[PDB]
Amino acid sequence: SVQIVYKPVDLSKVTSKCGSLGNIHHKPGGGQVEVKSEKLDFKDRVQSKIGSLDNITHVPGGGNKKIETHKLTFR
Amino acid sequence: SVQIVYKPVDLSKVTSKCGSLGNIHHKPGGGQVEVKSEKLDFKDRVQSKIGSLDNITHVPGGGNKKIETHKLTFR
Amino acid sequence: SVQIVYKPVDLSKVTSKCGSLGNIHHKPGGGQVEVKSEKLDFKDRVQSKIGSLDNITHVPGGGNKKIETHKLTFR
Amino acid sequence: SVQIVYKPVDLSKVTSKCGSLGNIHHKPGGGQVEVKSEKLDFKDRVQSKIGSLDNITHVPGGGNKKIETHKLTFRENAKAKTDH
Amino acid sequence: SVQIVYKPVDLSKVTSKCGSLGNIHHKPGGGQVEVKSEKLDFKDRVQSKIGSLDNITHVPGGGNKKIETHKLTFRENAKAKTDH
Amino acid sequence: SVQIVYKPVDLSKVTSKCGSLGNIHHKPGGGQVEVKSEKLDFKDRVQSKIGSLDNITHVPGGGNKKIETHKLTFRENAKAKTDH
């Protein structure tokens, strides 16, 4: 007489938390920004920021791969 | 006499939380921004931000893959 | 006599939360933005933001792939 | 309980006088201006100017400017909650 | 309990006088201006300017400027909570 | 309990006088200007300027400038909690 019980239990959790989570920003814009000139003159490939607020999250990551295999072979 | 009981249990979870989640921004616009010139002159490939607020989330990621296989072979 | 009981159980879950979720923005427009000149001249491939508010979510990601295969073979 | 008295007073006096603002007086007594062009060839996205002799005025001045701002803020409350 | 008296006073006197702002008196007695162009050849994204003798004036000045900002803030409250 | 009295007084006297600001007087009696161009050849993203004799004037001055700022803050509260 033969009895096989195959009863594995998976309660696991796989989680990613990526980028900006749960932050508090209080009054971040304040105070003077003054740019006084005669000429501003920007040519090829210029990036300029004057008194700007800029929140960027770039998330190429945070991916999850979960692989499971079950084999019972009886002969 | 042979008895096989194949009863695997999966209660698992696979999760991505990606980008900007649950952030608080309180009064982020405030203060003077002043740009004073006789000329502003912007030519090829210029990016300019004056007093702007900018929230960007780019998420190429956060994908989930969940592969499972079951075999019972009896001979 | 042979008895086979193939009864695998799947209550698992696969989830994506991608982009901007549950964020709070309170009075984000505020303060003076003043741009003051006798000439503004923007030419080829110029991007300009003056006092603008901008929320961008781009999500190429967040995709889910769930694969399961079940084989019972009896000989 | 709460008493707010908001009684700002303006009694200011502003005076401006301007004689001449931004006039063009244009009294050429003689001579000439000559602009000759003969074999021009302009193609994709050309901007061109030949023989500029403009008389131009921009006079936003002479007057006085006041910016005046008041705010009284009483018990401004904000509350923000995130849970996940 | 709470008394706010907001009684700012402006009694200021502001006086401007300007004689001439930003006029052009173009009064040439004689001579000449000549601009001559022949075989000009302009293609992709050319900006060009040949022979400019403009008289141009920009006068935002002469007058007085004041900025005057008042704020009174009483019991401003912000509260922020994150849980996760 | 709480009494706020906000009584700033401006009694300022401000005076400007300007004679001439930023005029062009242009009375050439004679002579010449000549701008000759014969075989110009301009392509991708040329900016060019030839023979400039412009009279240009920028006068924001002459008047007095004041920036005056008042803030009174009574019991401003901010509180922030993060938990995870």
Both tokens of E37, joined, read 């162009």
Report the residue count for chain C: 75
Q: How far is the alpha carbon of B65 from chain E, nearest alpha carbon, in Å?
A: 24
Residue B22: list chain E partners with CB under 8 A: 82, 84
Contact E82 B24 (CB under 8 A): yes
Nearest partner of B36 among C51, F65, A37, judged by Cα: A37
Residue E80: list chain B partners with CB under 8 A: 24, 26
Q: Which amino acid is at F63?
A: G
Nearest partner of E21 among B6, D16, B5, D52, judged by Cα: D16
Residue whose tokens read 């030839």 = F50
Contact D24/B at CB under 8 A:
no
Q: Which amino acid is at B59?
A: V
d(CA A53, CA B19): 18
Contact E18 D19 (CB under 8 A): yes
Residue F69: list chain B partners with CB under 8 A: none
Instruction: Report how this structure was experimentally obtained.
Output: cryo-EM
CB within 8 Å of B57: residues ≥ 6 apart? A19, A57, A59, B19, B20, C19, C20, C56, C57, C58, C59
Q: Which of B23, B26, B38 is facing E58, going by the closest CB pair?
A: B38
Counted across chains A and C, CB pairs separated by less than 8 A come out at 11
B33 within 8 A of A50, measured Cβ to Cβ = yes
Q: Please state whether beta strands B9-10 and E24-26 pair in parallel, antiparallel, or not at all (unpaired).
A: unpaired
Contact B26 E78 (CB under 8 A): yes
E68 within 8 A of D69, measured Cβ to Cβ = yes
Residue A22 dihedral angles phi and psi, to the nearest 5°: 75, 15
CA dihedral defined by B40, B44, B45, B51, rounded to 10 degrees?
10
- Resolution for this PDB entry, in angstroms: 2.6
Which element (helix H / strand E) includes E33? Answer: strand E32-37
| DSSP letter for each residue of chain F | -EEEEE--EE--EEEEEEEEES-EEE---S-EEEEEE---EE-TT-EEEEEE--EEEE---SS-EEEEEEEEEES-EEEEEE--
E strand intervals along D11-76: 13-21, 24-26, 32-37, 41-42, 47-52, 55-58, 65-74
DSSP label of E64: -
d(CA B60, CA C23): 20
Chain D interface mutation, best of B17, B18, B24, highest count of D Cβ atoms under 10 Å: B24
Both tokens of D70, joined, read 């008041």
F73 within 8 A of E76, measured Cβ to Cβ = yes
F76 within 8 A of A27, measured Cβ to Cβ = no
d(CA F49, CA B56): 41
E61 within 8 A of D18, measured Cβ to Cβ = no
Chain C neighbours, 3+ Cβ pairs < 8 A: A, B, D
Helix, strand, coil fractions of chain B, as percent rounded to 5 = 0, 65, 35
E strand intervals along chain C: 2-6, 9-10, 13-21, 24-26, 33-36, 39-42, 46-50, 53-58, 64-74
Residue F47: list chain B partners with CB under 8 A: 43
Residue A45 backbone class (left: φ over 0; alpha: ψ -120 to 50; beta: rest): left
B46 within 8 A of A40, measured Cβ to Cβ = no
Residue F73: list chain A partners with CB under 8 A: none
B19 within 8 A of C19, measured Cβ to Cβ = yes
Chain A interface mutation, best of F73, F82, F83, highest count of A Cβ atoms under 10 Å: F82
F80 within 8 A of F10, measured Cβ to Cβ = no
d(CA E50, CA F54): 12
d(CA A17, CA A8): 28
Q: How far is the alpha carbon of B26 from chain E, nearest alpha carbon, in Å?
A: 8
Q: How far is the alpha carbon of C9 from chain D, nearest alpha carbon, in Å?
A: 28
d(CA A60, CA B19): 10
C40 within 8 A of B42, measured Cβ to Cβ = no
CA angle A8, A11, A16 (to 5 degrees): 135
